[PDB]
Symmetry: D3
């Protein structure tokens, strides 16, 4: 009685997941107006069924978020037994603190919206800040791409046993030290003051910039120069979420990266056509597995240190 639906026309990721579960994506009649006012219609009964809605990758974040909330609403009032929002890349995740300003904690607002819309459970990957799980009261499964990253590293970087994992900023210290300790290698950190300061040993070593996401890439691009100027043999950047908006693709093609690796939490096909340094790690099996485990009441923690 499992039912999986896709956000928009970006069946992409959602279709891979459905395939891995031996299912077809459920039918959804969609109509979009001038004003981008989204009207959705669930094309099949979900009464008494375990529903999973996978968010699109359309690019327009507000349209995608509303579409998601609207679909959650529709399934809930259509008597679904349970509705789970599968959100690979959590919207407004970066806006999770006030940081000495009269700003909104939009990530909390989003969590509240998902809650009132009718979400009973959230499945996501690499929340920008683990504390975001505390923005909900409903259970959240925060999947890590770490296992998949450690594996990609050991298989694609010959010098991995002597590389350095580097955080592009101060906040990612924990993330990198965790990966460095697992691989038993060094770590380093970059801190932007407009000037970057690097601490840690990278000389004559392969440097691997690791972060949860990359958007305009101004930061990772500048970190790469800094790393090379410090004596790094070559530089890689591995982000789980590849937003790559604005001049990102332009900055990547010009940067000194050996390669830029990201998962497919966000559609990457079009970006790859204009950027060859980009390589993608498919995380559909991890999302597919978490969904199947959630449905069967089986252990999902198994995926935090294991590549299905």
């Amino acid at each position: 009685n499992i039912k999986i639906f896709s956000g928009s026309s970006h069946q992409d990721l959602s279709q891979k997941i459905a395939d891995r579960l031996g299912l077809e994506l459920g039918k959804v009649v969609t109509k979009k107006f001038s004003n981008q006012e989204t009207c959705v219609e669930i094309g099949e009964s979900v009464r008494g069924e375990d529903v999973y809605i996978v968010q699109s990758g359309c690019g327009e974040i507000n349209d995608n978020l509303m579409e998601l909330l609207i679909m959650i609403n529709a399934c809930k009032i259509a008597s679904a037994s349970r509705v789970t929002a599968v959100i690979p890349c959590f919207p407004y995740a970066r806006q999770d603190k006030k940081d000495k300003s009269r700003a909104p904690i939009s990530a909390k607002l989003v969590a509240n919206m998902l809650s009132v819309a009718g979400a009973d459970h959230i499945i996501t990957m690499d929340l920008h800040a683990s504390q975001i799980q505390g923005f909900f009261d409903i259970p959240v499964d925060n999947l890590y791409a770490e296992p998949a990253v450690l594996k990609w590293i050991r298989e694609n970087i010959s010098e991995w046993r002597n590389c350095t994992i580097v955080s592009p900023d101060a906040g990612g210290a924990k993330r990198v030290t965790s990966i460095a300790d697992r691989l038993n290698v060094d770590f380093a950190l970059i801190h932007k003051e407009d000037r970057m300061v690097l601490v840690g040993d990278v000389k004559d070593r392969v440097a691997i910039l690791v972060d949860d996401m990359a958007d305009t890439c101004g930061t990772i691009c500048h970190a790469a120069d800094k790393l090379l100027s410090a004596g790094a043999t070559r530089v890689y950047a591995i982000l789980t979420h590849g937003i790559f908006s604005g001049p990102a693709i332009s900055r990547i093609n010009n940067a000194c990266f050996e390669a830029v690796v990201v998962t497919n939490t966000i559609p990457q096909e079009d970006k790859m056509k204009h950027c060859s340094k980009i390589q993608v790690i498919d995380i559909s099996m991890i999302l597919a597995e978490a969904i199947r485990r959630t449905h069967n009441g089986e252990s999902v923690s198994y995926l935090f240190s294991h590549v299905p």
Copy 2:
């Protein structure tokens, strides 16, 4: 004590409102990220103030709604005393029932999002359906453009004394009969066979005034006009409180036989009017300004009805 902020670049309506109240719009820094991720930042203290946020009138409904929600939230966690959302045109108002389908009741979702965002009060105009008020637990003041529309009809159509108020569809019956009744004239309604349109009511040799709460692509209201002409209507006018003139609208009305198309200021019309001469806008900023002033001073708002 009172503070008024505006959403998006849209400030025409917002500025009109602040002026009428003798105030300047609150300062707010708005940076739109990559994927249009909305970033807002209240530029001044609202601690303990009676805050009013006037919704943007900038086409993209989802960006507008998110910015409004984010602004409400920022003010609330900034210890504002009270936050009122002033929403001339309630987003997703049309999606207010299932209509025999597994559809969302999006207008209730929106009501819930505004509530959890921290809105203490809502001020809107001509809700697509009065019942939408019940979608909230917080107070909602639903202002009407009817008085102004009535007044415009009497002062612009010489034959209004014996005109016919026509509803573009079955659902607008209550709206047109309310107006026809106030003016003491005939009403008629059109329905698309479920397609061919059918007309019930007397419009032969008399001015036909199409009335509807809103019109987007204007395909419905335009086709209704033809029917009205074929039915022997002298001239056909069209009055919409919310003019969401998108897509083919801008041209459809020109190519249409409308003697004129009247809409309110609830949504920015300057851009359109340029490419459309027969459009006339009724300014409702004064009505909204008065509602805010009364809401703040605890004065009666019903009088504006």
Copy 3:
């Protein structure tokens, strides 16, 4: 594990439903005081069971509503797995807007009361206004009597292919056009200003007044005269909810109706004894079916265009 209970002594409708489900109504010890203070006692365990409570027809709306809420409360604190309020005719449904006055939206208050009492699901028929579903957050199944009305029409009115469906008021335009389009006949509308205005073709045709409910019947009675004065061959009135209070039965016996048809969402037996123009459409099978579908997680939409 389905359990069905009846509101009060009006086992009537609730017993037909239980019979159709092959069940007996659950035991309920009831005690009513002077002040009509209702004390209820569930006479059997409902722990872990799917409960359905059918509202009475006692006539005293406030007593019935409280009794319903009290029973919902009792089952919920008695650990029922789920409690569904089966409310054929929704209380205070007409009070669903302010309509330019400082009035209560009692229909919303009622929905909130049902929610805090512990209702997890609502099953009702022909809500006065579809928007009422939005007064709840829990799922609502709003059954239509339309299929049963269209069927009664085709079977009891010879001239149905040439009749006119008429709305007694402005608000019922949608309802009638929907029925007219399905039958492929005309529609007409009556609007009261103290004077009625009729628009639409009814001359030399059978006119069928269709509405969701009839109370004092002053309106439908006056609409019938109006229709005949306009050249209608004869007039019928089909309401799903037959309140028939005050001088209704007197006004019906004197009116020019060929017949007045209503469903049994409200007990009609006593009214029929004093009014022979009244005929009843039994909707117990529709309620019974919706309940069985809800329980089995099967499609209830099937009943929106199909007579079980």
Copy 4:
């Protein structure tokens, strides 16, 4: 700023309260539909006001509760600043526990209905059980008639100095011992074998004063009186704060040997007193008026205890 409205035709208590506060009762149109469907309509603006709704005292508990709820809701969506429900006699207060059965905790249901209706504060008198206060999350002020009862006992029973306060049943023990203690006298309690009544305590050759929070049919309090006589009670009085004298009550007390039956103004007694001479009512309107005035002015209400 302060506004007082009354429920149902009952206005005796409501009018007494408004008078003591130097106010007139708010205007409210009340049309009772067919099946007694309650229709209410606030006749004036309450926007930003401190509204107090005094419950009806008109027998039908469910109609009364619905009218009270509907009134609270109307005021709340009318932007009232605050809504306090003044409920002398809390409906369904007796149904406040399961008592080893699959029964409703109706008093908690009622508390929840009042809350979701929008009540911000409750003012009541002698809750059947103090714990009922915990059924709300909003503030509840539970006034007591004890001081007034005490005062009436001392000024009406010459032998009060050595009288016995008796509880009609096991559950009223705490209530009677509290009074007996204040007056410095004996207490006794009666219990129906679960039936024959048993009496524990000394009442022989002394006035017996039956005390109970409420009495409906008076079958319990009347039988208790006989027992008290058989036990050698000089004379037997009966003091109830809530006199819901329904059914056989009106006559049972007459035919009873009560030297008198004292009740408060929490429920309309004029009608009954007519057919019953030995009934005496303690007016509590002043107590309620003072609670409202203090609630509004932020003054101490506990002093009234």
Copy 5:
């Protein structure tokens, strides 16, 4: 899919329950800081499982309450299907009214805390005041020790058919009359004014002081003297909850009780070592049974008048 966990190191009662259910207590990694800041870690998946958490007996009520809430929180966000708080002796139960003072109704606060923590159901024994069930909205099963007390009485007191059940205070009138009527014996009540007044017949009879709990025991000890001074042959005290704090054990050893009986809702082993008048009624089977019934959706009312 039933999972039972214990509050703290006091596996005691919780282990007996688990044994009776044929289960082992679930694994829980616990770490306690200086400040008694409790950090818990569920050592096994509870995803999709029916969870029961039994509160400790550690003695420090606030530490136990927090630990309980924290464990409820952990299981809820760990996706448990349902979480039930099994609380033998409800915390702050006595603080359930204002009683003419500006005091907190802590029992209500506790119920709210248990609710927001994530409790879906409460199982407890002899709530100080039945009204406490109304402090929650989630279902509460309030088990009675009465059946076990009536049984202990008939089996350990030869003169039980001619004894007197006595309430140590005014509030316990109902409790005792209920037990007296079941046994068909007399009842009596004690009321403290600093002076106790007794009403009821105890002369030449065995007096049994019955109450829900005993703490410092100053009250029951003074009631015993009073009873003997009134002509009682001997005195027993049966409390369901034996807090026995402060000088309780000292006051019991000196008092004139034939014996003081309590259930094991609270660990009694250490207290027994210093007090031989104390005897314990094991109520683990009742808690075990209520849990098994709750899980299987079977009747728990069966335990209100029956000793499993």
Copy 6:
């Protein structure tokens, strides 16, 4: 209108705050039952007042939290106008994420308990993580000790102009770089191999200032100091905003090479300082007093940041 109450016997901080505001602490009777069952009783009326409850600083975190919750609840059901919890050190702040385990997010539990207890506003200092603010729906003002720490560094360390701010672990990076940046100096971070500690950053021949939001047993900060010395640090200082010096802390710092250990007044330090000479406390009562005064008067609190 404003009332300030204190929790537990702790009143040092509370008294300092009331003094700065020209007020006396509200009266509250506190009886601790048997199993430490917390019993509180507001000794005066708070009806309609702006109540502020300053958390106890008495070691036992669970007793303190319960007393705070019980006090909030008592005031709320006593009709207080508004209840603000002033919590210098947010309990369970460290338990704010699952960290890849089936662990509680205790800090969110606490936030929820405070909310349901009736807290309308929270005032705290240096939340272990800014995100904790999002655990509430009610407003939270997170004050910072940074300005005061900065000021203390400049006025007590002669070599501060070229000192190195060091973080005891990976998680404190953002905190130290923020300070190092304000002072225009170097930062360094230490990490325990997951064990041996690693150090990244330049501390050779220069004063090392260990900065952390809090320190309990001081095992982490003490070991970090050794490392710093071995790395060639001139002298090593330690600055903690919350000094929960429990267990071995009191001695570990003495035996440590700290040139000094600076902590704020958020937790009682008098007792400890006695057995530790190198401890210096920065008083933050003025910062809290100002936050309360501004919160009450609707004045800007952000200025204190």
